[PDB]
Design a protein around this ligand. Structure first.
Ligand SMILES: CC(=O)N[C@@H]1[C@@H](O)[C@H](O[C@@H]2O[C@H](CO[C@]3(C(=O)O)C[C@H](O)[C@@H](NC(C)=O)[C@H]([C@H](O)[C@H](O)CO)O3)[C@H](O)[C@H](O)[C@H]2O)[C@@H](CO)O[C@H]1O
Ligand SMILES: CC(=O)N[C@@H]1[C@@H](O)[C@H](O[C@@H]2O[C@H](CO[C@]3(C(=O)O)C[C@H](O)[C@@H](NC(C)=O)[C@H]([C@H](O)[C@H](O)CO)O3)[C@H](O)[C@H](O)[C@H]2O)[C@@H](CO)O[C@H]1O
Ligand SMILES: CC(=O)N[C@@H]1[C@@H](O)[C@H](O[C@@H]2O[C@H](CO[C@]3(C(=O)O)C[C@H](O)[C@@H](NC(C)=O)[C@H]([C@H](O)[C@H](O)CO)O3)[C@H](O)[C@H](O)[C@H]2O)[C@@H](CO)O[C@H]1O
Ligand SMILES: CC(=O)N[C@@H]1[C@@H](O)[C@H](O[C@@H]2O[C@H](CO[C@]3(C(=O)O)C[C@H](O)[C@@H](NC(C)=O)[C@H]([C@H](O)[C@H](O)CO)O3)[C@H](O)[C@H](O)[C@H]2O)[C@@H](CO)O[C@H]1O
Ligand SMILES: CC(=O)N[C@@H]1[C@@H](O)[C@H](O[C@@H]2O[C@H](CO[C@]3(C(=O)O)C[C@H](O)[C@@H](NC(C)=O)[C@H]([C@H](O)[C@H](O)CO)O3)[C@H](O)[C@H](O)[C@H]2O)[C@@H](CO)O[C@H]1O
Lengths: 114, 115, 114, 114, 114
């Protein structure tokens, strides 16, 4: 697996507009909401769950990086894997997307896989 | 269990106004006080205690997040489970509420579980 | 044991004015000095030692919180237990007070045991 | 092995201008891009992968330092080992450079091996 | 052992002026250069090496504190133990000093062993 696998999904020129932290089934988790910097389109929501899925090792790295990009409001590319989370109320509140990477986008193209 | 369980309680548009760190019964803990951004109501107090209660795994995550939101003073939704801490002097000083989640808020919507 | 135990001591309306980190007998430790926000009174010195005293479990959390309050300079209530550290040269450089809690304050009141 | 070995390569007077976090083959990783402070030259890209290469032990310290230098925008010397990463889509997105050190730079010199 | 042992060396009224992070012999390490706040004297250099020397337990505490004092540029006292690192190329690049403590300094005094 890799953040950059073409089977994952990514969204360029976004900003992190919201951040949530909680716990589910003994695991810490966080979720972020992103929107296009220019205001177009609809939001992207993605979560990371510390004890769960092949992406679990990156939970702290992703949380720390999400917090920094959230604090700056700088443009980013968000990378997700769709259709991972399953608890229906959790998915309906947030989404089934697993957060799998974050790329800064301060130049012409975002610094990450495409 | 989940932050967003309907048996938990939450309060929207709160500002984290105070922060305390201490130790109780072998465990570091922290408590926060929150007040309505609009100045109404009565404060909410909640604590997290390392290695105690079902919420223990998220102690460090919630401490770091509480510190950040305390530093910005931004309006948040605070999620708690009531009647978790039982040490009576602790409860009298703070509350029995276990902190179980924190959500940022726009002016119209907080980003977290509700209803 | 609890930060708020009557057998501990506390000082309100203080600012953390100095910070020191070191090691003793294989244990990292730190010390802080505090002074009244208004300039009155006598300084308070306390230390936490990572592997020593009943307060060992709280070392990292108090170090992180001390650094935060040190960096803001805001008014705090410092909680200590007297007569804990015993190495004479250490006590004479710093004091025998163990740091056991830190509470934020406003003008007339602080958020913590009293 | 040492950051300073002559079989590594380094580039002075650089600024970290992009940062990416992800995961590959169960390992958290991050990449940075640096550009000369004065606008000359070609960008340098390097990545650290949490449990791969002889440089695995310094992953966390170099991620934290990369983040610090990125946030200040100060001039640094970046130390890499060339030709380490091998997954082609990863190398072509980023590079084969392993990140092995970061040194702050003044006007005329940098604080690190050279 | 103690930061404050008389067999150690300290230098007061210093500013941390450079910071370097790398890896040696499986150990992440950092070094700092300090110079007098008033611009006099010759610089001091000291390193901390993750799982090396009696001072290893304090590596993370000292790295976090060095980073903070580096970021503010405030006057500090640096405490070292001489003649610890033995690799000659490493010593020649940096020094044999082990960093063993850091103390904030006011205009009047420094908060640490003397
Ligand atoms: C002219 C051209 O090169 N492409 C056409 C574009 O007009 C059109 O809209 C574009 O947005 C583009 C961004 O492409 C991605 C991205 O965000 O990087 C590519 C992603 O794979 C895609 N993600 C998914 C799950 O499909 C993502 C997503 O569609 C949007 O972010 C949702 O808003 O778009 C690029 O910046 C273009 O320059 C810009 O005009 C895109 C449609 O994505 O393709 C062509 O129609
Ligand atoms: C009683 C109730 O469940 N909801 C009341 C509303 O009908 C009403 O209008 C708005 O309610 C807003 C959102 O209500 C919450 C919140 O803070 O998000 C919902 C929480 O479940 C509730 N928590 C608990 C333990 O009861 C919480 C709480 O009542 C207040 O925060 C206490 O300070 O309120 C929000 O409260 C607005 O005040 C209002 O626009 C009004 C009644 O007129 O208050 C709601 O409680
Ligand atoms: C003792 C006396 O003569 N008068 C009492 C005063 O304590 C008090 O005056 C106010 O006291 C305020 C807070 O008192 C503490 C504090 O800092 O919170 C209480 C602590 O337990 C105490 N710590 C110890 C080890 O004794 C601490 C300490 O004495 C001082 O902080 C050292 O400077 O004081 C605060 O000091 C205010 O400045 C003052 O207004 C009055 C209030 O009516 O009640 C008396 O009991
Ligand atoms: C006396 C002298 O300096 N002669 C030539 C210069 O014209 C120039 O070098 C100056 O010094 C700078 C230091 O060069 C490095 C560096 O970045 O520290 C040395 C590195 O080993 C080298 N790395 C690799 C993999 O080759 C690195 C690299 O070439 C450049 O950074 C890529 O941009 O340069 C630096 O070179 C300055 O540009 C210059 O002021 C150069 C050639 O112009 O080499 C000297 O022979
Ligand atoms: C003879 C002598 O060594 N020192 C005295 C002068 O230094 C002194 O002027 C003051 O000295 C201050 C420095 O004292 C230390 C320090 O940095 O705290 C003491 C340290 O033990 C010493 N470290 C070592 C390994 O020897 C350290 C070191 O010599 C200097 O830092 C190197 O620059 O100095 C400080 O320098 C002030 O500038 C000044 O107040 C005068 C005071 O009357 O008497 C001398 O005997």
């Amino acid at each position: 697996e890799w953040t950059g696998d073409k089977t994952n999904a990514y969204y360029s020129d976004e900003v992190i507009s919201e951040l949530h932290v909680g716990q589910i089934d003994t695991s810490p988790y966080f979720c972020i909401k992103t929107v296009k910097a220019n205001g177009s389109g609809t939001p992207v929501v993605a979560c990371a769950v510390s004890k769960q899925s092949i992406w679990a090792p990156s939970f702290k790295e992703l949380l720390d990086q999400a917090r920094y990009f959230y604090s700056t409001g700088q443009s980013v590319r968000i990378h997700v894997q769709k259709n991972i989370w399953t608890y229906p109320l959790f998915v309906n509140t947030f989404s089934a997307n697993a957060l799998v990477g974050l790329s800064s986008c301060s130049a012409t193209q975002c610094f990450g896989p495409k």
